[PDB]
């Protein structure tokens, strides 16, 4: 039906930009740091939602990295 | 009997001069794949002789 | 010339190396040629210079100069 | 540390078992057909000596 969340957006993904971990994480990440294992917090969350926020990102003409040791981190791409 | 036969040797004959150029020319091409798969990918992982 | 012919038909049907196909490289050690290879080597050599050779006779050459000496 | 390694290695496996069934079967293909046609040949050969 109209006026629906699903017509613009996938539920998981507004779901991941409404929590309250998002501004912080969005902020370092813009920034250039690194995400490891240790900061739980922050680790979980974009296991939560990888494929979200890679989708996301990709809208900047960024991509959304994450390393085989488990870290994630954002490579921009030429444009 | 034995000229009969000499025919039937004969057919065979040419029947193996065409499979022996069909055979050369298969192990022709083969070669480059051989070269190519020296990179220890053949050994185990591609002959899979099951 | 058949000297050469000999080591146009080795290189291009065991895949090794010109410089590596002397007179006295034998196959099945230097060439690395095996039971397969060999009996390919041989009907290639039988093709070119469209000729046959006996079994035994055939079996018994094993090396490049043995090949060119059974050829020449 | 589980939720990645488990991850990983899903990936892994899952590639190296498609991509050998891809590869290895057609090389096997081709090297059945010269097999089989160097069968013939020397069969050819023996009874035509013979």
């Given at each position: 039906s109209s006026t629906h969340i699903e017509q613009f957006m996938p539920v998981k993904l507004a779901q991941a930009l409404a929590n309250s971990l998002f501004p912080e994480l969005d902020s370092q990440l813009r920034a250039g740091r690194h995400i490891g294992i240790d900061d739980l917090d922050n680790h979980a969350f974009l296991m939560d939602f990888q494929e979200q926020l890679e989708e996301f990102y990709?809208?900047?003409?960024?991509e959304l990295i994450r390393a085989p040791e488990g870290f994630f981190y954002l490579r921009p791409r030429s444009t | 009997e034995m000229e009969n036969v000499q025919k039937k040797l004969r057919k065979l004959e040419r029947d193996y001069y065409q499979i022996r150029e069909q055979v050369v020319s298969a192990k022709a091409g083969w070669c480059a794949v051989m070269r190519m798969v020296?990179?220890?990918?053949?050994?185990?992982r591609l002959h899979r002789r099951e | 010339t058949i000297e050469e012919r000999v080591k146009k038909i080795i290189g291009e049907q065991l895949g090794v190396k010109q410089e590596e196909?002397?007179?006295?490289?034998?196959?099945?050690?230097?060439?690395?040629?095996?039971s397969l290879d060999t009996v390919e080597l041989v009907m290639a050599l039988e093709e070119e210079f469209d000729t046959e050779i006996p079994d035994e006779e055939a079996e018994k050459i094993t090396t490049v100069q043995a090949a060119i000496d059974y050829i020449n | 540390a589980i939720r990645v390694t488990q991850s990983d290695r899903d990936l892994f496996k899952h590639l190296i078992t498609e991509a050998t069934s891809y590869v290895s079967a057609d090389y096997m293909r081709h090297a059945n057909e010269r097999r089989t046609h160097l069968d013939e040949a020397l069969a050819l050969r023996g009874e035509l000596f013979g």
């Open positions: 990709a809208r900047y003409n960024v | 020296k990179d220890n990918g053949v050994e185990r | 196909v002397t007179n006295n490289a034998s196959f099945v050690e230097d060439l690395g040629a095996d | -």
